[PDB]
């Protein structure tokens, strides 16, 4: 169920406006359509009720000389036209469903249309994209100078888990919208009546880094052999297919005399897994010196450290 109303309308004093309320997701001719007025900082005022099944219109005595109710079955749309408009009429007008058969109750309301009645000049919005400034994805749009009052904002994205926040306006008529993202591109779309002053602005800052997993294993003494060859195995799983660089260190000083054997284990599309083998002596392992395989990929230094278990 959805009752679609325009975001905002603008007229000049003495003119007439035709507000609409489009139905969706329910039987159009089975519910009453009420119209309710709300001025900022005030309560609710009932205007009129219209029966979409027939022509049953009923008005409050206060609004009889100003309001006219209409129903469009082919378009499934309710209408309220206001005439003799003054600044006293600038308000949000909601349409609401009411159930008639059996019990009497309300349920679904519209979002309301903000009607402004003014002869003042119009200032169209200025859209500036808000640069996140590295240190965090948080995008946003600043709607600087605009005027008769109302401004609406929507967002486009290439999917993703995205949240949006629309902030209240300043007394100097400035507005801000923001978007938090949980790798795509983004843009914001702003509408500013009169008419459709639809502006749009785009922004994006992408990323792309793959983090591999390191397993530093060790070949220990076979208890059946007098001498065992101690060898360290640096397994790098899931790195970028063509970007990996392995070096070895002992006590945090790079090993250059002994050569390591670095071979490819597996390829999975654009990813790969490799193993680097390095031999050390039994004395070096027994000395409780540390050993490190430093893997460099995409400018990132992953490391793995090992040492015989002391005590």
């Amino acid at each position: 169920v959805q009752l679609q109303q325009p975001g905002a309308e603008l007229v000049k004093p003495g003119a007439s406006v035709k507000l609409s309320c489009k139905a969706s997701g329910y039987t159009f001719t089975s519910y009453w359509m009420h119209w309710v007025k709300q001025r900022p900082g005030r309560g609710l005022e009932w205007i009129g009720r219209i029966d979409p099944n027939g022509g049953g219109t009923k008005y409050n005595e206060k609004f009889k000389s100003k309001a006219t109710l209409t129903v469009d079955k082919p378009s499934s749309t309710a209408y309220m036209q206001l005439s003799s408009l003054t600044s006293e009429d600038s308000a949000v007008y909601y349409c609401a469903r009411m159930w008639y058969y059996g019990t009497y109750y309300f349920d679904y309301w519209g979002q309301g249309t903000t009607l402004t009645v003014s002869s003042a000049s119009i200032r169209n919005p200025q859209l500036y994209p808000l640069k996140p400034c590295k240190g965090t994805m948080t995008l946003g749009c600043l709607v600087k100078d605009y005027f008769p009052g109302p401004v609406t904002v929507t967002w486009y994205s290439d999917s993703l888990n995205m949240s949006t926040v629309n902030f209240p306006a300043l007394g100097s008529e400035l507005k801000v919208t923001t978007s938090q993202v949980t790798a795509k591109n983004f843009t914001c779309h702003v509408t500013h009546p009169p008419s459709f002053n639809e502006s749009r602005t785009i922004l994006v800052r992408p990323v792309n880094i793959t983090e591999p997993t390191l397993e530093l294993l060790h070949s220990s003494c076979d208890p059946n052999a007098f001498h065992s060859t101690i060898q360290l195995y640096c397994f790098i799983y899931g790195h970028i297919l063509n970007d990996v660089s392995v070096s070895w260190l002992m006590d945090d000083r790079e090993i250059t005399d002994t050569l390591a054997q670095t071979v490819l284990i597996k390829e999975e599309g654009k990813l790969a897994s490799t193993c680097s083998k390095l031999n050390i002596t039994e004395q070096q392992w027994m000395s409780e010196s540390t050993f490190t395989c430093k893997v460099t990929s995409q400018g990132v230094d992953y490391l793995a450290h090992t040492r015989r278990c002391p005590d």
Partner: protein, 222 residues
């Protein structure tokens, strides 16, 4: 490159819970073999290693702090958190987050700036600002040191300027002294003793914890 930034409450009441966040930039909290520590410095320059959480999720705490501290992490936000339960005045300290694990032997290879935490059973207080003017007459065309006493406020910090920053040079702002549960600070500016009688010498004191902004004009005594 890696950047660690601390974020705390500034002040906390005793018996309450202390929570400090460390935001990490440049590296992942799950990158292989890195360990993320909480350490703290007490006023007498004593450092105490509190504990760490590992790249693999494992945690280890200083036994003197066990049963009180808890280190957790959010890897999507790239933040890790220290929680200390039932704080006392002996928990007042400067809290750093650090990273070790680049080198092989338990050495901090990255440090944050640190965030100050005062554990005090005191509430937010706006300061009283008093003028500091000489108690005697000035010789013509001499130099005069005027000042402002910003007394009885909590918590830190407080910002003191002179003539809205116009008097930039010749300014001395002293570190606040904590007496009872309140801070006392003194600021001074040195101007020609011919400027003071013909122009305005005012200190602007701003305490954002109480949203206080006051101006104090230094008027000669009689």
């Amino acid at each position: 490159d890696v950047q660690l930034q601390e974020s705390g409450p500034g002040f906390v009441t005793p018996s309450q819970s202390l929570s400090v966040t460390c935001s990490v930039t440049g590296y992942s909290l799950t990158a292989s073999s890195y360990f993320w520590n909480w350490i703290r410095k007490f006023p007498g320059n004593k450092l105490e290693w509190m504990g760490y959480i590992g790249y693999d999720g494992s945690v280890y705490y200083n036994p003197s702090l066990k049963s009180r501290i808890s280190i957790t992490r959010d890897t999507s936000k790239r933040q890790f958190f220290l929680q200390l339960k039932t704080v006392t005045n002996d928990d007042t300290a400067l809290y750093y987050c650090a990273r070790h694990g680049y080198y092989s032997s338990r050495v901090m290879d990255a440090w944050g700036q640190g965030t100050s935490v005062t554990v005090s059973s005191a509430k937010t207080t706006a300061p009283s600002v008093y003028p500091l003017a000489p108690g005697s007459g000035d010789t013509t065309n001499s130099m005069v040191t005027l000042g402002c006493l910003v007394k009885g406020y909590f918590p830190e910090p407080v910002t003191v300027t002179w003539n809205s920053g116009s008097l930039s040079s010749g300014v001395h702002t002293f570190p606040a002294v904590l007496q009872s549960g309140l801070y006392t600070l003194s600021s001074s500016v040195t101007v020609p003793s011919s400027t003071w009688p013909s122009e305005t010498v005012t200190c602007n004191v701003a305490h954002p914890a109480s949203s206080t902004k006051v101006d104090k004009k230094i008027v000669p005594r009689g």
